[model samples]
Target: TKWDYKNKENGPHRWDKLHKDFEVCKSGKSQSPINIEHYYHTQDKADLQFKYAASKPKAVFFTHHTLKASFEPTNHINYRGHDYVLDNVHFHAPMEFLINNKTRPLSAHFVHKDAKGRLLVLAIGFEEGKENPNLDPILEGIQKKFKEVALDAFLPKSINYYHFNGSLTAPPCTEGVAWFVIEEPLEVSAKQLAEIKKRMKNSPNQRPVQPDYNTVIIKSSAETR
Candidate 1:
């Protein structure tokens, strides 16, 4: 059976039952898209940074679920003493995770992969506000063959974030992913939000909030003071 965001028979709730390898979707202790109602504070200062440059996307493709932009190995980030290279970026409508039980209009997951294949995902929530020029190329479709896009333009001015360990929000639900959810929400015009919905149509592409379980979400010490 094929899995998807819609269709209860093959939706997220039934993902584990859909495949032998998807058991983690039901049993993983550290699943993602957890609500951000409660989290601990870390005394250690935050050390998250980005080295993204204006570059052409390797590919901007769409799956049955969502649209994604694959990238070259140029962008990089070093977190918790380990270096990870940006691999791709994808979107979700009605943002996956909730902050204080609140939902946003949209979100993007900047997926990065380390040399050993560990995953580190940086999530950014988006609200309807100013027109975000950074999203123009993506929203316009790739048929036009857009030029280099400044990936940094996708980031908020302040990168202070809430950190946690969790599995992929989608199936196979791989664990041990390091998540950094930006505290601040970025702006995208209402038109852009509608454009994404038009492109994705029936696929809501967002996983419901999962349990935090034994996980401890920590706010960057930089935000505490």
Candidate 2:
């Protein structure tokens, strides 16, 4: 059955019935958007590194369902010695994960696809601050469940992030995805937050937080130069 958020039997709440493949949305152990509370804190010994941009991106567009944009393929992160290409970026509203059991207003999930076909998503939460001009480029026309809309400048020059394992927060809700969230948030004004709210779909686009379910959430040490 086709779906929309129009009815109890027709919306995302009922997607498990839309197709057998999507049943995981209702019953999956390693679901994403997990609360970022209760995790082991230690030095990050793995080979996790970033090579991102701090300039305006070359391509940016919204596909209506979600904000879709790409970073240059030359930009990537090396995890466990394997590089994952920064494929695209998207957003979630009212946030999907909790930091110390609390929710933020918005979050960005930077997606990367690896050489042998794997995914590593970097999530960064936001807090209101002074208006950021870097956002002006992708801020007009706008998108929903989304924001500055600068693709790369939002990331800090230094990196400190969380590392974990989970699934996609959207359809199929597939498991086995690698997740890392930047520890600190960048600034966006209250007005900017409203601009973000103005475009995303009516109501929240986030999934409820999942139980840890034996999954471990860990913090990676600050990046070494």
Candidate 3:
């Protein structure tokens, strides 16, 4: 059945009433887009490895297509006594999540999983400033893949990201969803960001932020000045 936004069927306002057990989107305290604060405790950063496969030449035009990408672990670290594999990473533009009352130009979510199928997302904020050479290859791939046929394709390069623990930013508002938001951000032209937004027009694909609940947010020690 097609989603009906008129009756607030799929709208954020009716999310709670739509589901019996689930809390309304508005009432949830663990929502995202919360203001960032400087009061965070520093912890010993965990050492991990990231391995990404090459992007296929195919373009994914519609949302129905499978995200044909894979992430493998080059090394492992103990988290709550379980080894988590550094899986695939992706981007969210216009700041799907926020920090300290600020929204950046873009952010990348590095997804991870353990033997038990739990998810850990690492977020990196990107702003307009100096150029980031590491992200150039991915941007090039997007252009090339979309040039021939307008669709989605995975990038070839996977950058090292920070790690932390937080909840899912979307429905079910799943707790225990580990989150790691990086201090440094990648660079993308404003036009490039606009192009992506234009392509995904009329889509409500983003999830609202979840609660912080005294969760400890961490960053890479190397990132500290």
- Per-residue CA lDDT of model 3 for 196-218, tens digit only, reads 55444434344544455654544
Off by over 4 Å in 3: 1-9, 19-33, 43-45, 49-82, 129-164, 202-212, 219-225
**Tens digits of per-residue lDDT for model 2, 55-174:** 334466654345556656756778888888877777677767778787787788888888777888888887778886765555653432223344345577677777888888877777
Candidate scoring better on lDDT of 1 and 2: 1
lDDT of 1 by residue, 133-157 (tens): 9888887655554556678666866
Q: Count the backbone clashes (under 3 Å) in each candidate.
A: 0, 3, 17
In angstroms, what RMSD does candidate 3 have relative to the true structure? 6.3
Best by TM-score: 1
**Whole-model Cα lDDT per candidate?**
0.82, 0.70, 0.49
lDDT of 2 at 224: 28
* Winning model by lDDT: 1
RMSD of each: 2.4, 3.6, 6.3
How many Å off is the CA of 89 in candidate 3? 3.0
